[PDB]
């Protein structure tokens, strides 16, 4: 309602002693949103990824790059065709609100029981010997039964796994090699021997197989986020760009509240975000106009309320501490702020102290003894 009621609320009391009290900070709120993404138009070629005529074997998993295009992950995520669409560093709803640096689709076929092994941290002959994800994988694993697309009644032996290996393979390693594996302690030469094996095996994929024993196509999407100049984005239009005003910006999924400004920070070509000592972004390259914008948070400070006792008077004065007055009147309640009571914006008795802008108290030339201390040599009192 008013600064006195806010102190009554902050002290949890209906009556307030004479004093100066701290209350919730004023903070200038976003005037409008800004959104900025690269001005690319063509959609991502998912018809060649998900609707290719034939997929690769899991021993020889194909890796396709997605770049210089616009994504629409709602076309994928809302489709009932996917038996699994599991994300590991994002929620699937946020993919349309977000930007991606480099994006690789890993395409292959496995048994339906093995979809559980494609996730990061997993193990078993697929995860150990032909397709490993890193522990800190950011991306999503997408799978569907391709039984009707790819399976024949004798068995489509074109799809192969790796059953044998001298060591487990590294994250995103691909092993094509057809070297014979010796499970016996004896070495072996030529093509074959006892307890000696060709390291690959074909699946017996038939449409008469039980569910789980049927073929599943998999796409793993393996993007990296928010740290580098993007090349793929969600289907959101850029707004116009404005400067020297408080806004809710979003640069390539870097959402935040701030005032933008034309920076002299010399980014080298590979950089898109600059960080502060607090590990927060304080400059960004705009993705449409290749210029560097300083980000600074909106004007704010503590609000101290100066009062005689409730037993004396309900009149109060407000110190906007650490602020130039210039800013107070800027703090016009025309738009949103943390505090609501914009009633004092009237002034005509305001004062610039070294402590901040003081409102609702009259500056008098006659010095008195200290009563309520304001700071930097200034004190307030309730007098005739």
């Amino acid at each position: 309602l008013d600064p006195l009621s806010e102190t009554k609320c902050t002290l949890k009391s209906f009556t307030v002693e004479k004093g100066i009290y701290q209350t919730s900070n004023f903070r200038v709120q976003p005037t409008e949103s800004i959104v900025r993404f690269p001005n690319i138009t063509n959609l991502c070629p998912f018809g060649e990824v998900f609707n290719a005529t034939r997929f690769a074997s899991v021993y020889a998993w194909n890796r396709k790059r997605i770049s210089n295009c616009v994504a629409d992950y709602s076309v994928l995520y809302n489709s009932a065709s996917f038996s699994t669409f599991k994300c590991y560093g994002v929620s699937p709803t946020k993919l349309n609100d977000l930007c991606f640096t480099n994006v690789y689709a890993d395409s292959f076929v496995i048994r339906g029981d093995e979809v559980r092994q494609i996730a990061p941290g997993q193990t078993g002959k697929i995860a150990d010997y032909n397709y490993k994800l890193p522990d800190d994988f950011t991306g999503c694993v997408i799978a569907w039964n391709s039984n009707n697309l790819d399976s024949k009644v004798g068995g489509n032996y074109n799809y192969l796994y790796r059953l044998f290996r001298k060591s487990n393979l590294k994250p995103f390693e691909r092993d094509i090699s057809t070297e014979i594996y010796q499970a016996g302690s004896t070495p072996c030469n030529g093509v074959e021997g006892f307890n000696c094996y060709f390291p690959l095996q074909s699946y017996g994929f038939q449409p008469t197989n039980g569910v789980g024993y049927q073929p599943y196509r998999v796409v793993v999407l393996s993007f990296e986020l928010l740290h580098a100049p993007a090349t793929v984005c969600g289907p959101k239009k850029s707004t116009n760009l404005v400067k020297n005003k408080c806004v809710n910006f979003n640069f390539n999924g870097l959402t935040g509240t701030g005032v933008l400004t034309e920076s002299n920070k010399k980014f080298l070509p590979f950089q898109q975000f600059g960080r502060d000592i607090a590990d927060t972004t304080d400059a960004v390259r705009d993705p449409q106009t290749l210029e560097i914008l300083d980000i600074t948070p909106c004007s704010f400070g503590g609000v101290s309320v100066i009062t005689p006792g409730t037993n004396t008077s309900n009149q109060v004065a407000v110190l906007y501490q650490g602020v130039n007055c210039t800013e107070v009147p800027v703090a016009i309640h025309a738009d949103q702020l943390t505090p609501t009571w914009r009633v004092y914006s009237t002034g005509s008795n305001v004062f610039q102290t070294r402590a901040g802008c003081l409102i609702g108290a009259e500056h008098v030339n006659n010095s008195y003894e200290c009563d309520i201390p304001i700071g930097a040599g200034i004190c307030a009192s309730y007098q005739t």
Binding site: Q22, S24, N25, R27, G256, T257, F300, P373
Partner: protein, 49 residues
């Protein structure tokens, strides 16, 4: 004789420009306040000293 008076807004230190975080910090209750009373007690004492 004295040291720099500091006021820290915990709500802005912890949940910087987020209402989602701010609504979670309310589940810790008095934690945001008791720190402001402690630092105000220190700050008031610098003028006393």
């Amino acid at each position: 004789v004295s040291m720099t008076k500091t006021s820290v807004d915990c709500t802005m230190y912890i949940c910087g420009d987020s209402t989602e975080c701010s609504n979670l910090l309310l589940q810790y209750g008095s934690f945001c306040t008791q720190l402001n009373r402690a630092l105000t007690g220190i700050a008031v004492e610098q003028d006393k000293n």
